[PDB]
């Protein structure tokens, strides 16, 4: 890879610079390079990886939705479809790249609950993004791949993490969105968000001020979704 000649520490440094410069494609390329060094990622480094690719795929998804809507309204020549397909293929490529990093070899080397849950949550999210654009023979298998990753993450998080842990909360938030938006399971979505919120509320008393702030931010996003869905 193109980052093979750069020091791991320099890749991490440049990823942070790229974030400050809002150069998320560069940030992702630097973090891919860092992962490919073969060493486990620290907490901070995992967050850099996540931010980078979330921003890249976020832009692609937003563009895809714009184009897909124009295409739907068209149903003129092949151009709308062609360009939607172009964006779709690029999105799929980014998701496949992230999934590839997780599979080679981030997940298998992740032994601590925090790391393993983080990566399995990512795996669910990127299969979810593939599901958003999927049609044809494999869509069910993509959906099930997302579900399976999220479910393993949920099982570990319930056993190993407090109900206020931000990763646990974020996982629950995203899995509930999977249920609502992908799996046609709004009741499951609502039940997951509600139970997550309530169990977190009950554990807030254990937290410091700074931990309280983070947990309550995510709880408010759960509440916001519950409000939207009910």
């Amino acid at each position: 890879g193109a980052m093979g000649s750069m020091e791991r520490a320099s890749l991490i440094q440049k990823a942070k610079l790229a974030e400050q410069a809002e150069r998320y494609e560069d940030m992702a390329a630097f973090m891919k390079g860092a992962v490919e060094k073969g060493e486990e990622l620290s907490c901070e480094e995992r967050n850099l990886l996540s931010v980078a690719y979330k921003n890249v795929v976020g832009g692609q998804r937003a563009a895809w939705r714009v184009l897909s809507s124009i295409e739907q309204k068209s149903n003129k020549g092949p151009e709308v479809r062609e360009y939607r397909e172009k964006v779709e293929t690029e999105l799929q490529g980014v998701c496949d790249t992230v999934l590839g990093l997780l599979d080679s070899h981030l997940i298998k080397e992740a032994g601590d609950a925090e790391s393993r849950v983080f990566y399995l949550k990512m795996k669910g999210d990127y299969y979810r993004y593939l599901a958003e654009v999927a049609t044809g023979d494999d869509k069910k298998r993509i959906i099930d791949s997302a579900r399976s990753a999220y479910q393993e993450a949920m099982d570990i998080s319930k056993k190993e993490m407090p109900p206020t842990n931000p990763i646990r909360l974020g996982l629950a938030l995203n899995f509930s969105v999977f249920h609502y938006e992908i799996a046609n399971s709004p009741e499951e979505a609502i039940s997951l968000a509600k139970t997550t919120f309530d169990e977190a509320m009950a554990d807030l008393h254990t937290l410091s001020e700074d931990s309280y702030k983070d947990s309550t931010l995510i709880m408010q996003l759960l509440r916001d979704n519950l409000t939207l869905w009910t």
Partner: peptide
Amino acid sequence: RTPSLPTPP
């Protein structure tokens, strides 16, 4: 679509 988790603060 429903909002998923945003970037951390």
